[PDB]
């Protein structure tokens, strides 16, 4: 049985100025050591207050696309074989409320070579439960080409292992992950 | 004191431009982002328009996408919504707002009324033959 489902992010897309938005659900194939035995389908389980709870099958997939409308929408993603679905997973849900609602302080980026970089961040004495950060990172004034790697909030800095291309200067959105739903990032701009 | 500022509202026939400005005070853009909101005649204060705080990248409402560009001018805190052929539908009372940085960063973002922390006293804008 598996014992943790994948660790996932998102990326959005449709009009800022409207609520509703395509919701794509981002994971990495759960490695040999990861699960111990092999991984055969991913699950997404959805919760709303008013639609209740229902889960997709999504195979050996590592992307899921949803139309988010909802005040509030969980999703947890699972990891399956012919033993079971991973017991504790992951989760996000998906609150505009919530993401007006900061977190992070200050955020630093140190080019420490040219494909390693530190994050180094400071967190403002919080209400809201933080469950974890996730670091996104893309070319400055670029559509898509974004990265994501998820921080445990019991540290202070991180370092982020990429083929940049140096030439271009990269834009870094911390994004601070509450119980209650996805939060406001801070944003820095810097070459690598 | 913060103070926002819009001007340049009107009266214009269906297929003509209008240019609005928002001058900003009692805070920079570096700290702030500003956006563009209107008003329509018993409706709520919707998104229209805005401009990242990290990048140049600019975001729209679907109805005015191509016809609206917003532009800032730093040195000057100020932002600018050009508005070319105007139809009826866009008459309303027009709204630059500020948010704490950052704001209009990527497709995560919504542009929101609630999420505003300052508001200008809005201006005018009337499509009508």
């Known amino acids: 049985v598996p014992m943790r489902g994948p660790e996932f992010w998102r990326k959005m897309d449709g009009d800022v100025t409207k609520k509703e938005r395509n919701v794509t659900l981002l994971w990495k194939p759960l490695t040999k050591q990861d699960s111990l035995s092999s991984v055969r389908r991913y699950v997404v389980k959805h919760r709303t207050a008013h639609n209740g709870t229902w889960s997709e099958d999504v195979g050996n997939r590592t992307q899921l696309t949803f139309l988010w409308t909802e005040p509030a929408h969980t999703v947890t993603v699972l990891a399956v074989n012919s033993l079971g679905a991973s017991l504790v997973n992951f989760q996000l849900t998906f609150s505009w409320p919530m993401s007006k609602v900061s977190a992070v302080e200050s955020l630093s980026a140190y080019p420490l070579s040219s494909s390693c970089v530190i994050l180094s961040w400071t967190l403002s004495p919080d209400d809201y439960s933080l469950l974890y950060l996730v670091i996104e990172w893309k070319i400055l004034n670029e559509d898509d080409g974004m990265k994501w790697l998820r921080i445990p909030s019991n540290v202070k800095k991180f370092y982020i292992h990429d083929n940049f291309i140096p030439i271009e200067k990269y834009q870094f959105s911390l994004y601070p992950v509450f119980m209650e739903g996805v939060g406001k990032p801070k944003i820095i701009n810097g070459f690598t | 004191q913060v103070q926002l500022q819009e001007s340049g509202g009107g009266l214009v026939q269906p297929g003509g431009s209008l240019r609005l400005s928002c001058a900003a005070s009692?805070?920079?853009?570096?700290?702030?982002?500003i956006a563009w909101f209107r008003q329509a005649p018993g409706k709520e204060r919707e998104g229209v328009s805005c401009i990242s705080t990290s990048d140049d990248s600019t975001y729209y409402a679907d109805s005015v996408k191509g016809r609206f560009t917003i532009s800032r001018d730093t040195a000057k805190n100020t932002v600018y919504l050009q508005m070319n052929s105007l139809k009826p539908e866009d008459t309303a009372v027009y709204y630059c707002?500020?948010?704490?940085?950052?704001?209009?960063?990527?497709?995560?973002?919504?542009?929101?009324?609630?999420?505003?922390?300052?508001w200008g006293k809005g201006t005018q804008v009337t499509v009508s033959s």
């Open positions: 009692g805070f920079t853009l570096d700290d702030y982002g």
């Open positions: 707002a500020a948010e704490r940085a950052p704001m209009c960063y990527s497709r995560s973002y919504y542009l929101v009324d609630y999420g505003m922390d300052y």
